[PDB]
Structure formats: structure tokens, C-alpha cells
Amino acid sequence: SELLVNTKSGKVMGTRVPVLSSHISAFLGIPFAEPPVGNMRFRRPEPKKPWSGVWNASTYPNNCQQYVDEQFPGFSGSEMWNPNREMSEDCLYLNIWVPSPRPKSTTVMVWIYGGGFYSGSSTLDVYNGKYLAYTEEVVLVSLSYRVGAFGFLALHGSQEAPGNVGLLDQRMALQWVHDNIQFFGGDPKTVTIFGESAGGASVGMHILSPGSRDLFRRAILQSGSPNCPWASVSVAEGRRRAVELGRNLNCNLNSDEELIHCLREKKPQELIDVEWNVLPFDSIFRFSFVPVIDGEFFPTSLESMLNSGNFKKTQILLGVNKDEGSFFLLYGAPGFSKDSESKISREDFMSGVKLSVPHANDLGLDAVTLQYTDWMDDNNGIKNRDGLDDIVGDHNVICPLMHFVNKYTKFGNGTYLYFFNHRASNLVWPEWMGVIHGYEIEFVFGLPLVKELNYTAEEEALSRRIMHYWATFAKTGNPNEPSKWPLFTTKEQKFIDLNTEPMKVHQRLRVQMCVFWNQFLPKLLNAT
Amino acid sequence: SELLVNTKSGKVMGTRVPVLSSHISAFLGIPFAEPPVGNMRFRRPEPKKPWSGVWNASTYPNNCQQYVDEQFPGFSGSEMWNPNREMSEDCLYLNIWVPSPRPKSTTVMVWIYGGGFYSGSSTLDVYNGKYLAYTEEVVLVSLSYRVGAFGFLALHGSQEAPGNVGLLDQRMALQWVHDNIQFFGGDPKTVTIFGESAGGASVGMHILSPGSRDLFRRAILQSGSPNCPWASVSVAEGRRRAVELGRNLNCNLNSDEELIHCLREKKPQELIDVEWNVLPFDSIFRFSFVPVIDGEFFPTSLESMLNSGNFKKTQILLGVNKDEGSFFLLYGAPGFSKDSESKISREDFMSGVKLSVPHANDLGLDAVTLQYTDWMDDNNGIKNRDGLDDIVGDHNVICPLMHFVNKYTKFGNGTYLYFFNHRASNLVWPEWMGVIHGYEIEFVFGLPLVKELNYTAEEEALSRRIMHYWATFAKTGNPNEPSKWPLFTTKEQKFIDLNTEPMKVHQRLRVQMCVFWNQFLPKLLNAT
Numbered sequence A, B: 001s002e003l004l005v006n007t008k009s010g011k012v013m014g015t016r017v018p019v020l021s022s023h024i025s026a027f028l029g030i031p032f033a034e035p036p037v038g039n040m041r042f043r044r045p046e047p048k049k050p051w052s053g054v055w056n057a058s059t060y061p062n063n064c065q066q067y068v069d070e071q072f073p074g075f076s077g078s079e080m081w082n083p084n085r086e087m088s089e090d091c092l093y094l095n096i097w098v099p100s101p102r103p104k105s106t107t108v109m110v111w112i113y114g115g116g117f118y119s120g121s122s123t124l125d126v127y128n129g130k131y132l133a134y135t136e137e138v139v140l141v142s143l144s145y146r147v148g149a150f151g152f153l154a155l156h157g158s159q160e161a162p163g164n165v166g167l168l169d170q171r172m173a174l175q176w177v178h179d180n181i182q183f184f185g186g187d188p189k190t191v192t193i194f195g196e197s198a199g200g201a202s203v204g205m206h207i208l209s210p211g212s213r214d215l216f217r218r219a220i221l222q223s224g225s226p227n228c229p230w231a232s233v234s235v236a237e238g239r240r241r242a243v244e245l246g247r248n249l250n251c252n253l254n255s256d257e258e259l260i261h262c263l264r265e266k267k268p269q270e271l272i273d274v275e276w277n278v279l280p281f282d283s284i285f286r287f288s289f290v291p292v293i294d295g296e297f298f299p300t301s302l303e304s305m306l307n308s309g310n311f312k313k314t315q316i317l318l319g320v321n322k323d324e325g326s327f328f329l330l331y332g333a334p335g336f337s338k339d340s341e342s343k344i345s346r347e348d349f350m351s352g353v354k355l356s357v358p359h360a361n362d363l364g365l366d367a368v369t370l371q372y373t374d375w376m377d378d379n380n381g382i383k384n385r386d387g388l389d390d391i392v393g394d395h396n397v398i399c400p401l402m403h404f405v406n407k408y409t410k411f412g413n414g415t416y417l418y419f420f421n422h423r424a425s426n427l428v429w430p431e432w433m434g435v436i437h438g439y440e441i442e443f444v445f446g447l448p449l450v451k452e453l454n455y456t457a458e459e460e461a462l463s464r465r466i467m468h469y470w471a472t473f474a475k476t477g478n479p480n481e482p483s484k485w486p487l488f489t490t491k492e493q494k495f496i497d498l499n500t501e502p503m504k505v506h507q508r509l510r511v512q513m514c515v516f517w518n519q520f521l522p523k524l525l526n527a528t
């Protein structure tokens, strides 16, 4: 055996993959649900019928349908994130990298990919778990889940297209892992789900959803938080967008049945083509088809849940990157461009903030500008570029995350917080973008170990520390082997910097700005 | 003669006063209007009937009735500001210090005292013009004007008690100066009115009032601005307070006639006793009987006037002191005390801001706290003490002054701005109060020249510079004799520090904070 495994669904043949100077076993493309094609589009996933024979798990699966990014065709910095396999609706599979020799029972790390809920692949090279599995000796798996319309369309009172289906796909994979990781050497009672962006937000959504709390132990959230403004919509909104999509394809909108049948006949690409049209406003960092607060997956509003402790209580490890805004600005705010150093004028500055705070009213926008502008240097293009980069970041990633942390820490069983602020020496994006959203993942997956990728030795050191913290936290529940990375406490809110220097512990990650967003802004907008 | 002068009202005999190593002539107590006693209380001042004989002008006049401050009885720091002569309703007189030998025609400086409109005397030792008159060879005069109820009660549609009467008294003295300073060697076409606190606000009110624009050339405003929130009330409000006072003395409130007669029978002290009761709210830095925007003295709201250029266009010299709040906090905010270093708790901090912003709503207060609190050190007593000291100062003196400057500069003929931030070495108030409101006046009047007062030599130097700037500006219109004290421009808003070091020019005095008060706060409060 070694490469032959009997799972409760059938047998699977993997491959021996080279890792550094050795090998590992890899089982790629194991199906975990029935292909949600045909009349199953938009419906919740079915558990997969067992198979006879041996499933060949030697190649990656297809990727789900999604919007291909071709804003900088050929550019590696963007291309590295695009589906590198044939897209297909039939894309619910999972991959597992297992050590050699196969362990008896060891920790498991399940990776849930990001992509703003409209994109993502498990087959990307920055998600190749061979290095982590090998260096830390853990079993690592990667899920697949429907993104976009296909995974989050939500005609609420319908069985044909209830929302959150992509969320259910995640769960189903979590189930299969629970019920079969043992045959691969993993301990089902010690699986940690980790994810970034929408993945990190999904993770926190599993910590909240009653139905998923039991299929995992601990969780890691990277630049994501379930309460982030771009991660959920009400049923009403989902309906709104669902129908709006329908009219863009000129579907009969007299009933959900008609609407849905119609959408089920359209070719996948047609859906993607008009997907970005249904948003209700001009905005940046906002996605169309996202999780809906439907009353099932989430019993109540996430805010009540956070306030009542209605969530799984384990320990979590989470964090943020220094320049979370960059990517969003560069891709859709006027004035930024990849080959320029993007100095923004006050005109484009004000245009930017409108895009970042789509729900603010005049007074709100005014309030934001007040805080983010250096009044004694009002028209400085560099300062304006940077201020915008912090508006997007604080509003959309840092401040909601800090909110989550504070409400979770009251009842969780430990919290570790990091601030990743290192720019890879080989970054191909411009220096103005800084430490970009998505850029710590190279570290967590150990790509610096690959000398051919040109990282400095000091960075190799850094990913090994990161990988260890991640692994040790997954096993133990504390990232430190027996300097200490302090626990985060509501009292003395400590966190650490995660860069190549001697570690520094700091306190109160972005308080000043975060009280503005978490307490002032909302009141303002409500009073008005 | 020398000491005998014929004025258009009658002859006056002065005194030769020692000044340093020499002498000067001083004419103290020259009447300028008919004593507003009896049935004239509350009424506008009459020009004084000429007299026969020689008026003996050898002693100071009586002081107007006012509230004596006895919060720290015997303490010089407070006592220095209390009436040092018998108070009387008969107090409209003026004083003039003239050089020896009498000049032919020279610049004139008329001092209008401060006191929040409820107090003030011209006879105080820090307003003794012998040093200025001598060192700079100018004619210096000091007015007297009714303060409190007696000078600002305002039953609008009444001839018996129209408002702004104290303001008219100032004018009348300005008239007499215009019509007779020549007999003392002064040039009526080169009189500069200077004043501090309410005096500085009065000065700006003369620059605005059509009726006074012609009796003076230039103006100096120290820690005051006509648009400061505590300097004026609407006719409605004045009526309100006028009647409220009436009920505290149980006057018949069926008519202005009854009310007024009643108030005219009360002894002066009764009025003072309940004077502070009529305010509409708990507050700090707010006075009861103040100028009313009546449509006569001020044709329109001061804001329209500022916006339309409806004001005298000459050059002005104005400024602020570093710690304008101190005195107000110390006198009526909970937690501050003279012999303690007043570390304020967040409780008293929040109590303080409520007192400083009596018109803010919850959201407004919230907005202030946001800006003035150091969120990463929330409970620091020192930081809270200081923050409050800046709330009061920025809200009540610095920010309105900067507003005035900006609107005036568009149409004035030159503007010079200073930031006085030197703490006298012999200050008897605690170090936490810093550079207190009122404390530059010692400098402007040259008391450091008096060696018996114990100032350092470096301070002697400082008052001579100050006195020169003040004198030279009064003559020329520019404080610099032919480093330069730049003009203030709306473009590059320069100002200078006025302390014993090498002069520094800075830009944009308190922009950040001032945009909050001048533009944000008001909108907020209006939207809500």
C-alpha cells in the first residue's frame, strides 16, 4: 500500500511526489460530493456515491468556473492566482499530501482558499502542500467549493437555490475528512481549518455555524473575518441580486422556478459575464454573490452570535498584513496604476473614499476624510495614496478582524494574533503596494524553501518559523514550542510582528483607527 | 502747562508720574459720558456735559460694579485681576499716559480690557500704561465700560434696555479720543485699539460695526475674536436671560417696563448675586450678559459680515496663548485644583467635555472625545488633563480666531499672527496651567522692566520686543522696523512663536484640530 488507501467511499491510488530531497505521497482530486452539474446547479451538494475500483488520485482536479483575471495578461503577479486547470462545474474534489512513511495518527490542516467568494482554486502552486506536509509532518488537505453565482446565488425561500451552497460544499469536505482521514494517518480529533481572505472568513463562519462546529478543532484566519462587510448579505439583498442577474440574462422573472430554470440553462460563462453587473453600487472590495444570513447556516445575525458566545470555543490564531488595500486600489480606484508610483490627487482621493465606503452618507465620507487626511499637507500625492491604502485596509480587513477577536476572546480558549509586514525580496508588484493582501501565503506554504524561487536565506528562515508556528498551533493549540508569542487578551491586547527581524510584541493593533470604524462611524451613519 | 490741558469738554490737570528713571504725565479719571446711574441704568451712554474749572485727573476712577473673584482669597494670581478701587455705577472714565515732553502728534493706543464681559478694570496694575508710553513714546489710553447686567442686559425692543450698551460706552470713549487726543499730543488718525479676551472680541466688534469703523485705524486682538461662541447672543436669548434675571429678583414680569423699573430699583449687588444663575446650561467659558446681535450695532450675523467683507479693511495683529483652557478648567471643571497636578480620570474627563461643549449632542461629544483621546493610553490622567485643556482652548479661542483671520485676510490690508508660549519665571499659578489666558499682558505692558517684580533679564528683553512690535505696528501697520515677522496669508498661513528663543515662523496654527471645530463639528451637529 503506502499509496493505496481504502476509504469508506472506495479505494484510492496516489502518487509519490518529490519534496526537496525526498518524497511524499499525494492523493489529488478525491471526489467528495456528487458533481453539481445539470439540474443540481445551485442546489446543496450530495454526498458522493461510493465507487468500485481504485480512484486514480494522481492529477489535480478541474477548477470551478470563475472569472479569470486578465487585467495584466501574462503578468505573474496576477497570473499566479488564476485557475491553472480546466475549469468545469464538476469541480468538487479535495487533495491530501501525506508524509512518507505514512503516519499512524497525526494533525491535519485543511486549507480553504480565498478569492472574494468569486474565485479560487486549490491547485494553485502557492497552495501546494508538499512542503508543509513534509517539513512539519502533518496531513494537509485542500478543499474546493463553488464560488460566484454557482455557489452563492440565493433565492431564499427556495430549495432549488437556497443560499450558502458553497459554504455547504466546504462542510461536506470537512465531513469526508472527519470520516476518512484516519485511513491516511490523520487524527480526526485534531484537524485545524486554515484559510485566507474569503477562506479566513469562511473559517470563522464554521466557528459560528452550529452545523459545522463539530468537524474541526482549532482554526486559523488570515486577513478575513466572518463579520467583514464584504462577506455576507441579507436574504433580501441576495434575492435582489439574484433577480437582477436574471434580468441581465433576460430570464423570465415571474417566479423563482422560472428564474432558476432559466439560469440553469445558461452556459456557465454567461453567468460569469454579467456577474459583476448586479452590485448595487460603485464600490471597491465588495463582491456580488456572497454568503447570506439565512437563518439556517447562521441562526441569527453574526453580531448577536458574537455578543452571545454562540460559537465554538477553542483557540484561534489570526492576523493581518500591512497593506491590505493595495490590490483593491490598484485594480479599481482611479489614479493607481501598476507601473507608476500612483500619487493620488485630492480629487481622486475623494473619489477613492467614496468607493471604499459605499454606504457612507456625505457626513460619513466627511468623517473618514477628517481622520485620514494630514491637514497640514492636504494635497500630498504620496500621503493621499497611502491614506487610501489604509482606508481600504482598516475598513475592510483590520477593523472587523479586531472586532471579532475582541468578542471571541471573551469566550474562546486562547487567541494568538500576528501582523505580517514583510515584503518578499522577489515581489513583482510595485513597491508602493507594500505587503500585499495574499502575500503571506507564500510563507505559510514554504515556497521560500524552493531555492529556485530566489528568496533570501533570511526569508527561508522566516517561512520555517511561520510553518512551525502554524503546525505547532495546529497540534498543541499554542504556536510556541515549550520568544513566547503572547496570548491576546482583552486587557493587554498583545500581538507580534511577523517579519525577518527579532520578534516584537506590540499592543492594541490599530486602536485609534479601529475605534473610529467600529464605534464612531456606525453611530454617525445611524443617527443621520 | 505740560500738565494742564484744555479739551473740548473742559480743562484737566494731570500728574507727573515716575517711570523708571524719569517721569511722564498721567491724566487719570477723565469722564467721557454722563454717569449712568439712576434712571439711566441700562440705557445708552450720554456724552458728558462740559465742565468749568479744571478737572483733577490725579487719581484713578472708580471701577464698575462686577463680581469680585474670591475663589482663592489673598492669592495674588487671582487678586491681581480684581477691582482695586471702589466700585460704583458711576465708572465711565478714561486714563491717558502721555510722554514728557508732550509730543506734537504721535500714535495712540487705546486699551479695552477683558473679563468675559462680567468683569474688568482699567486701573489694574497690569494695565498701567506708564511703561509703554515711556519706552515707546506713544499716548496710551484705557477705557471703562459697563460689564455684566449693567452693560449688557438686552430687552431688545426697548429703549430703556436695548442691548450692547457697554459696547456703546466703548464707542463713546473712542469718540472722545478722536475729538481730543490732539490736545495731548496724539494723532487722531493713528489710534490703534488693542484688547484681550472680551477686549479683543470687542475690538473685532468695532471692526464690524459700521458705526465704529471710523474712530480708529488699526486694531490688535489678543485671545479674543468677535465670532467666539461666548461673545454674543441672539436677541431672543438676551430676552430670555433678561427675564430670567427678573424672576430671580422676583420682579413683575408682565412687561419690559415693569421688569426694567424693577431692576432699576435693585441695589447693584443684588444683580450681581444672581447674575450667574440665568445661564441656560451647565458650562464652562460661557457668560451670561454678553453682546446681542441686535441688527443695529451688528447689521447682520457676524458670519455674513465676515463672508461679505462687510467690515473695516486695515491691518490687524492678533494672537493666542498656548494654554487658554487652564483658567477655566481650574475654576469650574471637576478634578482640577490649584495645589494638585490635576490628573483627570476618564470620568471627570467626560464630565469636562460636556461642560466645554454645552451645545453638543451625544454624537457631538462622542466626536470630540474621538479626536482628543489617545486611544492607546485611554486612562492616562495627565493626558486627560491636557486634552481637556486643549478642548477648551481650541473650541473657545484658537479655532474661532483662526476662522476670523481667514475670513479677514481675504479683504484686509495685512495680517500679523503670533502664538505666545512663554511661561513667566515668576508665575504663581501651577506648572500644569502652563501659559495661561491673560498672561501675555504682563509683557505687552512692560512689567518685566520693573526689576522689583523678579523677571529674568531674558524676559526683559522679550517684553521690549513685544512692546516694540506693538508700538511699531500701531504707527506703521507692520510690526517690523525696516527677523521679519511674515504676513499671514491664506496660502502659506505663517505665524511666529513669541517666546524668549530665536523666533520661529510656523505654518497653519492648529489646522487639524481647527478643521474639526470649524467645519466638521458644526455639520455634525446640524445633520443630527
Ligand SMILES: Nc1c2c(nc3ccccc13)CCCC2
Pocket: A069, A077, A078, A081, A114, A115, A116, A196, A197, A327, A436, A437, A438, A439
Ligand atoms: N487574485 C488575487 C488574490 C489575492 N491577492 C492578489 C493580489 C494581487 C493580484 C491578484 C490577487 C489574495 C488571495 C485571493 C486571490
Ligand SMILES: Nc1c2c(nc3ccccc13)CCCC2
Pocket: B069, B077, B078, B081, B114, B115, B116, B196, B197, B327, B436, B437, B438, B439
Ligand atoms: N480674572 C482673570 C482674568 C484673566 N486671567 C485670569 C487667569 C487666572 C485667574 C483669573 C484671571 C484674563 C483677562 C481677564 C481676567
